[PDB]
């Protein structure tokens, strides 16, 4: 792997980084810089006393100095590569400002001296990971959720929906509701515990009102979770109330439509003659789409909104937590893509704005 192209998917929560042609990212680490509450600690150095900063908020880079620290860490600490040896594919959020795209390009070529690079939209890569070039992606990670309709690789910006509700908000909501049975989780470390509970025990009910009316009865619903220190907590309806928030954002006092509604609204902003192709190709990607039941719930909800004749297919791969990265690995490994890299020579001649003409 001395010169294998690199693929880096910079999330609000996790960096996923690795080598093109691999089936999974070699390195997955938190997108944080930590400082004493030695001057700074990046990624897992910080996770291991410190106040944390996330340089990407809701998928958009908002702290460039710390982002540069994150990229440095990715190359020198995590992947341990000389960046000059590797074409590098980066990812970006849908609707990323042009200035941001340019700055990422400038940093990669001028600061890290990469020989070639490219920037692709995260949702487009997830779509490609499924083998498709047309469809509508629900991409939901730690910091942001989007519905992104894509036709032949082009995201359709007028139809893109952004919702700030994503995994971090769901953790915070689970912390709040766990206060009802009386379990207090408060600190940054305790928030991580509740993230883990969310990931291990939460699920999306097919029929929420019925699941509530039932919980109240049964139970295989109640589940126990053992804390690091050996004590146990038990959770019941919180298991499915937490991610229900994706369908009912009013649970956290947000006025937004839920993700089934936003998917439908996004499809309805697209030309009518491509809608059938969108419905038949709804891809889910990102960690917050990992809840058991969420694909069946979306299928039910979209079916209820869509024309009754419409073929609806939700594609929710088991690796979807990494589908963006995987689609980058696949794309950067294709013969077809090699002509598409921005080369250092091209950058020298055209400057950072070359990204707009080459990455689309």
């Amino acid at each position: 792997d001395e010169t294998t192209a690199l693929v880096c998917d910079n999330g609000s929560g996790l960096v996923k980084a690795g080598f093109a042609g691999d089936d999974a990212p070699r390195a997955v680490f938190p997108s944080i810089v930590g400082r004493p509450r030695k001057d700074s600690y990046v990624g897992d150095e910080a996770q291991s006393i410190l106040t944390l900063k996330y340089p990407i908020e809701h998928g958009i880079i908002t702290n460039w100095d710390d982002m540069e620290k994150i990229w440095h860490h990715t190359f020198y600490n995590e992947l341990r590569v000389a960046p000059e040896e590797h074409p590098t594919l980066l990812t970006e959020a849908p609707l990323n400002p042009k200035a941001n795209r340019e700055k990422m390009t400038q940093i990669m070529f001028e600061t890290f001296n990469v020989p070639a690079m490219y920037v692709a939209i995260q949702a487009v890569l997830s779509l490609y990971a499924s083998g498709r070039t047309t469809g509508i992606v629900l991409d939901s990670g730690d910091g942001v959720t989007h519905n992104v309709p894509i036709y032949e690789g082009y995201a359709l910006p007028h139809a893109i929906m952004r919702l700030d509700l994503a995994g971090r908000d769901l953790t915070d909501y689970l912390m709040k509701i766990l206060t009802e049975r009386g379990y207090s989780f408060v600190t940054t470390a305790e928030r991580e515990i509740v993230r883990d509970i969310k990931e291990k025990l939460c699920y999306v009910a097919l029929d929420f009102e019925n699941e509530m009316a039932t919980a109240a009865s049964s139970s295989s619903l109640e589940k126990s979770y053992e804390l690091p220190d050996g004590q146990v907590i038990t959770i019941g309806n919180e298991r499915f109330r937490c991610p229900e928030t994706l369908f009912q954002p009013s649970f956290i006092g947000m006025e937004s439509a839920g993700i089934h509604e936003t998917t439908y609204n996004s499809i309805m902003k697209c030309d009518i003659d491509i809608r059938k192709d969108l419905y038949a190709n709804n891809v889910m990607s990102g960690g917050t789409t990992m809840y058991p039941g969420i694909a069946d719930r979306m299928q039910k909800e979209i079916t209820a909104l869509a024309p009754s004749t419409m073929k609806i297919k939700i594609i929710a791969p088991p690796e979807r937590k990494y589908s963006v990265w995987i689609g980058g690995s696949i794309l950067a490994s294709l013969s077809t893509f090699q002509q598409m890299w921005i080369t250092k020579q091209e950058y020298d001649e055209a400057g950072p704005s070359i990204v707009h003409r080459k990455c689309f």
């Binding site: 089936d23 490609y128 990971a129 499924s130 083998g131 498709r132 070039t133 036709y151 032949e152 690789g153 082009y154 359709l156 910006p157 007028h158 697209c270 030309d271 491509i274 791969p317 690796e319 995987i326 696949i330 294709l334 013969s335 077809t336 893509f337 689309f360």
Partner: peptide, 30 residues
Amino acid sequence: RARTEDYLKRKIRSRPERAELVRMHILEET
């Protein structure tokens, strides 16, 4: 993951130009 990259390569190789999507009203002019 897709069972093959074969159709993906063929789709990329025959990808329409942006101007065509605009003419078709799939994309807005920009």
